[PDB]
Amino acid sequence: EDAGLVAEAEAVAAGWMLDFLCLSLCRAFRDGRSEDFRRTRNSAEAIIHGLSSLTACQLRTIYICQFLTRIAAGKTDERITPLESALMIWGSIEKEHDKLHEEIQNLIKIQAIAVCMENGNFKEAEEVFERIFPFKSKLLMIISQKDTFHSFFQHFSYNHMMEKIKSYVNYVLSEKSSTFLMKAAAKVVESKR
Amino acid sequence: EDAGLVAEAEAVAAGWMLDFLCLSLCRAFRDGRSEDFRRTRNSAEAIIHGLSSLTACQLRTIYICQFLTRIAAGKTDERITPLESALMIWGSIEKEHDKLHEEIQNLIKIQAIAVCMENGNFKEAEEVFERIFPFKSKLLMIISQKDTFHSFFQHFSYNHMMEKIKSYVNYVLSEKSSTFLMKAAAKVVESKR
Ligand SMILES: CNS(=O)(=O)c1cccc(C)c1F
Numbered sequence: 001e002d003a004g005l006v007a008e009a010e011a012v013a014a015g016w017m018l019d020f021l022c023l024s025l026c027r028a029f030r031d032g033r034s035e036d037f038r039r040t041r042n043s044a045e046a047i048i049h050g051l052s053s054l055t056a057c058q059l060r061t062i063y064i065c066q067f068l069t070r071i072a073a074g075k076t077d078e079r080i081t082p083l084e085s086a087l088m089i090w091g092s093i094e095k096e097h098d099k100l101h102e103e104i105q106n107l108i109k110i111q112a113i114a115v116c117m118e119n120g121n122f123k124e125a126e127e128v129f130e131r132i133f134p135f136k137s138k139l140l141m142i143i144s145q146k147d148t149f150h151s152f153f154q155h156f157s158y159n160h161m162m163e164k165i166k167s168y169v170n171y172v173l174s175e176k177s178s179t180f181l182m183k184a185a186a187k188v189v190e191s192k193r
Numbered sequence: 194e195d196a197g198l199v200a201e202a203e204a205v206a207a208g209w210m211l212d213f214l215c216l217s218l219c220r221a222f223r224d225g226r227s228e229d230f231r232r233t234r235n236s237a238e239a240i241i242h243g244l245s246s247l248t249a250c251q252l253r254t255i256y257i258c259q260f261l262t263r264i265a266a267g268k269t270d271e272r273i274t275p276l277e278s279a280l281m282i283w284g285s286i287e288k289e290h291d292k293l294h295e296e297i298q299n300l301i302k303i304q305a306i307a308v309c310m311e312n313g314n315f316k317e318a319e320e321v322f323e324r325i326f327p328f329k330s331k332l333l334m335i336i337s338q339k340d341t342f343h344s345f346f347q348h349f350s351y352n353h354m355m356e357k358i359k360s361y362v363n364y365v366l367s368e369k370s371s372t373f374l375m376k377a378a379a380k381v382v383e384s385k386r
């Protein structure tokens with residue numbers, strides 16, 4: 001056997017596993033299956049360690065997985081919160097900055113502050129505000145008054161953030177629905193049955 | 194879409210990933226590629242968390258992976274050493290107890306003691322001896338005298354243990370060489386080249 005060709009076949013298989021695990025992670029995020037999401041994320045992280053060179057498509061795939069991981073840890077080394085880390089990934093993925101991209105960005109920006117207020121950590125809420133940001137003075141007064149349920153926070157809500165992110169996830173899910181591993185697996189299941 | 198059929202396709206794909214990762218783990222163990230082995234092992238462990246029901250074949254596959262993991266940590270919660278844990282797995286795998294099985298068993302039994310002596314921990318070497326075992330009195334005198342390079346230890350050597358285990362690994366490697374994921378990956382590589 002040729003060690004070089006074996007390593008190449010392993011890299012091809014790792015690429016197939018990555019797309020399958022991104023698909024699975026997307027579905028688990030959409031369905032709210034927390035434990036399944038946690039398990040798929042762990043598998044994705046481990047599989048990604050086996051890849052040392054990634055194409056542009058594979059980089060988008062791993063950054064979508066990292067972004068969803070941060071969003072899922074939103075209410076739970078970097079010196080920033082998970083939602084701030086999701087914002088950094090979101091603003092750096094090679095993707096179009098369309099209307100949906102902007103809506104998700106602004107929702108994460110507000111929720112990075114609101115999740116701290118929901119948890120009763122108002123000093124952290126002001127620290128998140130300072131790192132991200134008359135609009136600013138209005139938002140700072142709201143945080144300062146612990147006005148967690150202000151109409152601004154109710155419009156830029158956690159539920160609205162999750163709904164917009166789930167709409168984006170449906171596009172990723174559609175784009176990867178035909179990838180090799182899930183497609184071959186669905187054929188085996190349809191043949192049974 | 195049907196959640197039940199999606200979960201079934203994910204279980205089929207996990208089964209394919211498990212066989213591919215067992216193959217990769219076996220090759221890495223045979224080649225002495227330590228870092229590749231460590232990475233494949235981490236991926237295998239994570240993938241196996243996604244399976245809640247295993248067939249007899251899948252149980253053999255995960256126990257072969259666990260056995261090789263313990264052997265690889267041989268010189269590096271359970272209250273026993275890695276080689277003692279490899280011995281427990283080895284004696285419980287659903288496999289034929291042929292000549293090779295016995296040779297590997299006896300080599301691990303001696304090496305579980307010898308690796309402690311190699312590391313200069315003779316109290317641990319006697320504790321391993323007590324947990325595993327005129328032959329016994331001869332072996333205990335050898336450990337007691339720190340006679341690490343006694344002709345008995347040179348015949349039941351670490352190198353001999355690794356050679357016998359590698360011969361067994363070649364049978365696992367041959368048995369799984371045609372599994373779905375590695376086979377489809379090799380076709381893609383051969384088409385390029
Ligand atoms: C999927 N992408 S990843 O590169 O495996 C990754 C790296 C670091 C942290 C996380 C959560 C992560 F998911």
Ligand SMILES: CNS(=O)(=O)c1cccc(C)c1F
Nearest residue numbers: 106107109110133135136156
């Ligand atoms: C600098 N703030 S902003 O980006 O202009 C802004 C204005 C209004 C609402 C939101 C969520 C927002 F992020």
Ligand SMILES: CNS(=O)(=O)c1cccc(C)c1F
Nearest residue numbers: 237238241255256258259262
């Ligand atoms: C592959 N089998 S396994 O079940 O993932 C496993 C469980 C516990 C410890 C180890 C090292 C292990 F590999």
Ligand SMILES: CNS(=O)(=O)c1cccc(C)c1F
Nearest residue numbers: 299300302303326328329349
């Ligand atoms: C109880 N000891 S034993 O199993 O009979 C034995 C005899 C000789 C050599 C070895 C390695 C051995 F394990």
